[PDB]
Amino acid sequence: RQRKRTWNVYVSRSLRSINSQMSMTSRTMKIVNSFVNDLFERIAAEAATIVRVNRKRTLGARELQTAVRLVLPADLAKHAMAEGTKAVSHASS
Amino acid sequence: RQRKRTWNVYVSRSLRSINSQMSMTSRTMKIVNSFVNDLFERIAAEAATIVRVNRKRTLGARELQTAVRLVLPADLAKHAMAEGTKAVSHASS
Amino acid sequence: VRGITRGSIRRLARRGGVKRISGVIYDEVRGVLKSFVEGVVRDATAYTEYSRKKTVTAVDVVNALRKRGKILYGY
Amino acid sequence: VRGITRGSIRRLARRGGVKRISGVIYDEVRGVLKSFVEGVVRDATAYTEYSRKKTVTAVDVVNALRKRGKILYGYA
Amino acid sequence: LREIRQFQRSTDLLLQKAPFQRLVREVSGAQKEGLRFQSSAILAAQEATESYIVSLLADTNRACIHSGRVTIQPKDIHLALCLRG
Amino acid sequence: RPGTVALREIRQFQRSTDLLLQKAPFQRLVREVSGAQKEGLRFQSSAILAAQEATESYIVSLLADTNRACIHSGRVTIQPKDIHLALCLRG
């Protein structure tokens, strides 16, 4: 039997980040898992479309910046791109 | 200057096959060319989604049979699949 | 489609926020619901038929809905 | 948006098929037109800025429109 | 008035669950007979069917209240469908 | 003669294909909107027309939907509540 790949551990850690004693049901865990999956699919598909349009072969951070800019609403997009750039810069050093 | 690739010759050949005395303006050429490009992208995106969801790596005829059945309405899709199967059977043998 | 009773349509309408329902609404709602379910199942059948399987798992229905536009979370 | 005259809104409505237009429709149609154009331009400038270009081309606008589900034919 | 708030506050499945299964299997047989289903996919096909009808009826309510009425009529459903596809 | 020139314009402007918004003020609006993001951005002559035609299509569809709602309301005069209803039902 193949192991099941989900985001339950990371979602639980994210919830513990804000409120430690906060908890969520199994159905809510599936809801957040599906939200993560389809947001990943949306952003990755937008980045792939950008790559195809610009005739490139690399889905890097720059492509994902534009994918996040196009998919997310502007007020949330600003925070999301700021967080992504911060994480990329922190990882590079 | 790099050569630009369009379906002008192919669309014009299809029109001549449909009616030898017909013609379309440059703007209609662009409209039909963008129609072909949009349908190419829409069918290929569904085929790629089918490949991704079922964890495969080959985009063959079945991945496009199912894509055509998924995207287009039933009555038009039936004829499209029939013509695609006819062409594939002609080419294979 | 006639199995979908008047009570279920009335309850869905109450969740939708109406106060009164005409007597002709029920048939139209049944027709729309049957058409929507027919499309969703027609599409999940295509997804299932590609997989060379003869079962419609929740993933297939979710994908069929996602292509249609009405995305679904939790399956 | 004040450059979007009453005549343009009236012509758009007549093409849409209305018979009589209220005196307040013009302002709301101006608002929705400005919002749509703002969305389209803010979406096309992302494509233009990604490709290191300082010129928003028709392909970028077409892609931006396709993002919102308003696919446009004849500009590619 | 009471039932509107009662059903908006509630979150349970509203359509009958066995007649809906019968409708799904009837449609599948109409497409092509012999197809088997999954007990975890009928609920998915129902929670997105009741959501669609609930949204359609809320749009119908908006259309009818816009008309000065409080009762939905087939023309309201037709306007809601024609306004969205 | 209320009810004659109205349908004259309905049939005149529904059989036509040319642009309806005045090109220059719409171009000014597009450039003013773009200036709020990055000043000095340049627009292709084709990109402005491609945006204008899509905006025309969107406004025409919205106004036709609003007219459908107004007719459903038993009127012939479109009002801001009709536009709000059409926008709410569409998205």
Added chain:
Amino acid sequence: GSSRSVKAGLIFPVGRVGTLLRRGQYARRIGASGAVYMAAVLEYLTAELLELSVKAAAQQTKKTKRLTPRTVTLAVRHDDDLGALLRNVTMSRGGVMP
């Protein structure tokens, strides 16, 4: 006609369709039959649109022999299947159906 397109009897190019599929990176590998099938589908859809546009041009009072964008728009909007696929699609300088 291309050698690999004529052998299949199609009009659209099988080779160029396959190259477009590979350049788009839709999948890691693409079968040869997939390009043929996509070319056939595109050819059929273009042929259907052209047939509908020709019929709509014939329906006009003027016996025009040139496919204006208005004719394509009318043919699309009057059909029940090609007008549902091409919903939310704006034909440039095509107007709207009366």
Added chain:
Amino acid sequence: SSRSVKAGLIFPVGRVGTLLRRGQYARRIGASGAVYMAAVLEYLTAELLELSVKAAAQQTKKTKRLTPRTVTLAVRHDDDLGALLRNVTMSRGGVMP
């Protein structure tokens, strides 16, 4: 993971990279792309859970568990995340009054 903690994130950067490769969105996928995707996913998840926690306190009952009804209400109330999720139907969710 080494890179998940080095980048300063809680979401995986190996899972995201492998998922992107398996999706074949592009032939080559940059190493920084995985970090960026993981960061964006983590921020969106954190914002969704923050909205859920905020909206759970406003309930008449001080429930300490996020039921699907509560997260659906939190999504519906917010304008920004609500516009993003304006067409999704959360399983066993509901409609805001």
Added chain:
DNA sequence: AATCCCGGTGCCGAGGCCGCTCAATTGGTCGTAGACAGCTCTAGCACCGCTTAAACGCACGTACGCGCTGTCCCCCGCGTTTTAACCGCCAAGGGGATTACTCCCTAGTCTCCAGGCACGTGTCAGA
């Protein structure tokens, strides 16, 4: 009172031919992943029975639906005057587009271990 058919035209604008090249086509090798067969046990369909929520048929009132009436001012629609939109033209030049080149960044391989997960259980929300 307004709206459609057609003759001549000039005015393009789509189609046609020549040179050329980039991409298509062919032959050969090789590795890969897709199709196939078998094992296994999951769950999917079928059935029986209890409880009862729920559907449904009827009686009855009302109150919202629909039509009618009256007003009134909110918009058609016409003429004047303004004015700004459309087009063509002249340059300036910023920047798009193409090519050559460099390196750095990523695919692929090999080896290693630990992060993730499945089961069981420990301990706590809720009706």
Added chain:
DNA sequence: TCTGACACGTGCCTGGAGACTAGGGAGTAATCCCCTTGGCGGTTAAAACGCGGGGGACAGCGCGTACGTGCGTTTAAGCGGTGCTAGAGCTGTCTACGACCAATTGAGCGGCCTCGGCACCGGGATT
């Protein structure tokens, strides 16, 4: 308060990670010229304003019927407990074929040319 439900302990296993190699491709400099800006003037469609009036928008009134609400009967849904088994999920394997490379070449494209199809405009039919 028992019932149900989310999260540690622990071991198991595949994939994340580091080192190394090898090109692929993204980024950059150089260069050319294309297209965008721009501003201007000449023209003429368009609109902004003032105005009269007329006809739909709006509200009140009245009649009625159909929709809701309550009573009472009936129907099958839900579940849930069991039973049988059809087929999904997983593992090996053995090829067919798709990628990649070297060589060949022709189908398509850019440029120049061509010719007739047709949008137009007024004049004469029509509504």
